[PDB]
Amino acid sequence: PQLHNGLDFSAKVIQGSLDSLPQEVRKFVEGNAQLCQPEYIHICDGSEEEYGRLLAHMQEEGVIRKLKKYDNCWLALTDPRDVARIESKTVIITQEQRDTVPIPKSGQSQLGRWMSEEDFEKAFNARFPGCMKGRTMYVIPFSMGPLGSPLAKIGIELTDSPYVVASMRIMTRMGTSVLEALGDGEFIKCLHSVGCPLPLKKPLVNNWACNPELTLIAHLPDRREIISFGSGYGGNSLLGKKCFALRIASRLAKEEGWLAEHMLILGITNPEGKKKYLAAAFPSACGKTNLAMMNPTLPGWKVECVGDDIAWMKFDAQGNLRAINPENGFFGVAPGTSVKTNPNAIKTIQKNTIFTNVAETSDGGVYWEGIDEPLAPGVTITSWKNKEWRPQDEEPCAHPNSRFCTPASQCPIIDPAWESPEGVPIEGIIFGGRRPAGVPLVYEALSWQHGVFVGAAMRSEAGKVIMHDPFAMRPFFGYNFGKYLAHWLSMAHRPAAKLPKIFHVNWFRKDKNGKFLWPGFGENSRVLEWMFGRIEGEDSAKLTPIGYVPKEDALNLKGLGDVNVEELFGISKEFWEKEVEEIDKYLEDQVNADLPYEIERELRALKQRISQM
Ligand SMILES: Nc1nc2c(ncn2[C@@H]2O[C@H](COP(=O)(O)OP(=O)(O)OP(=O)(O)O)[C@@H](O)[C@H]2O)c(=O)[nH]1
Ligand SMILES: [Cl-]
Ligand SMILES: [Mn+2]
Ligand SMILES: [Mn+2]
Ligand SMILES: [Mn+2]
């Protein structure tokens, strides 16, 4: 219905048809077209043709550069004001603040950022009206998880950024098949704008549209909406990556009885032909992607990658914890990636990959700190700021959190079940962070409840600062962390639930000279071997106040020899007395009235065990 001609946007559709869309999808698209006033509407089909044409268009406009040395690889350099996920501008809107974060006892909550509905309404009206003027609104239908998986969820992202379209094609399952699978079902509404309507009011920097002053990444779980404005970058703009995958999904999981977690999933096979799947939650910069595609050093062992960042997990009727990787690609940190630290990533990213904010070599290759690769004489480097750069300079050639964006199907060790709609059965969950002192290489939680406490007590080095990052989810909780703990704990009362063993690792313990005690990377297969046997029930553990650690000689150290096991597994009363005190202060303040009894009990129990050593 229409008294004039400003409500039907059919005349502006340059690919697809509004009449083809499911009724509620059409209302989403047309309502925001009316608000944002795009010049064109492009309904993405996900085809190779649309993808290649969009890439070529971005190339002609200077938005991306083709990397000549590789096969269909591309480089985007951003406005340096728009280089990362920005927590201070990431908010969750609920009626009551207590649904989004626990009310802290004394301090400010660091477990989330709540915004009232009225405040968001003002912010929204100050940003989105007319924000796509002169631009194409792309409609991205995408599936989080294998199409038709019982654990998959569907989203529709509206964006004015072709960079987002290309990246979402890699990181999600995108296109016409998703719309047909959606039918009249439920979907998450995702609205994104870089916030630079034409004609441009402010200078465009590095051909990268963004609006840093007005950047705001909002989540409305009760409306099943994600609304992001002002950033074109990564987790701010690829709304499946963190906004859907963790923040919205963790609320859905709370309501529906499953788990959405900042975890890799890997499958490990031992020399006896036995295969187990493990999940691991490490904070950013703590090596999930290295572990997920590890090249094991132990002969006869094999590791295969299901996902490197996000896990959606649900106990099935048989009681197995079944996990899917809801992503379709890897959005990995580039700096530090080398043949030594991640050879399988190096193989994956040389075709069909989009790089953002890395350096470019004069022969059309990529470069970054820690690449640990020499360049032939004559080869020169352009920094991520589009300036000539030489290794004898201070500033980095690549942004510290520059990324590659690569299809998961290309990983040479992608797991054969990485797209299985039923998911893979998780037998162990690993927590870990950067702890230069005090925390052993590996230990095993004494019970599910103790394991949940271990996840809750996770800390990690940021002068050095040791921060709290419970479950590696501190930036990503979609709801009250205290209820999230209760949700985890409630899994132990499920029907026939086969609870995975929980472990905590530390690759980063250092000696008094600051050298790593453990070589890490592929040598972490030796730690996975110990976990593997522990899941099988092997008698390879000794009890300590913090949990089980490997017996003397239980860890396979053949081929190392120069490793200080006593210091690596040293457990100091002095350190752990201070550690439990800090955990106690943290949980009391930050979780306060929503701290489950079982977690307080595990804290008291650990305090008591440490007091007796
Ligand atoms: N010493 C040591 N460092 C490691 C090991 N594994 C990974 N790293 C370091 O971890 C960093 C890479 O971590 P990231 O890619 O940022 O970790 P991530 O968990 O994948 O982070 P996100 O992609 O943001 O979720 C580099 O500094 C690596 O050197 C290890 O076993 N030992
Ligand atoms: Cl354009
Ligand atoms: Mn990663
Ligand atoms: Mn991550
Ligand atoms: Mn309980």
Residue numbers in the entry: 3 to 464, 472 to 622
Article excerpt on this structure:
To demonstrate the capabilities of MMQX, the conversion of oxaloacetic acid to phosphoenolpyruvate by phosphoenolpyruvate carboxy­kinase (PEPCK) is observed with a time resolution of 40 ms. Here, millisecond mix-and-quench crystallography (MMQX) has been developed, which yields millisecond time-resolved data using far fewer crystals and routine remote synchrotron data collection. The Ω-loop in all our structures is open and disordered, consistent with the hypothesis that the loop is open in unoccupied active sites as well as during the product-release steps after the reaction is catalyzed.
As the unmixed and Δt ≃ 40 ms data are isomorphous, maps corresponding to F o,mixed − F o,unmixed can be calculated. These show clear hallmarks of GTP to GDP conversion, with relaxation of the α- and β-phosphates away from the Mn2+ catalytic ions [Figs. 2(a) and 2(b)]. As the Δt ≃ 120 ms data are no longer isomorphous to the unmixed data, we cannot use as sensitive a method for analysis, but general inspection of the data suggests that little has changed in the active site between 40 and 120 ms.
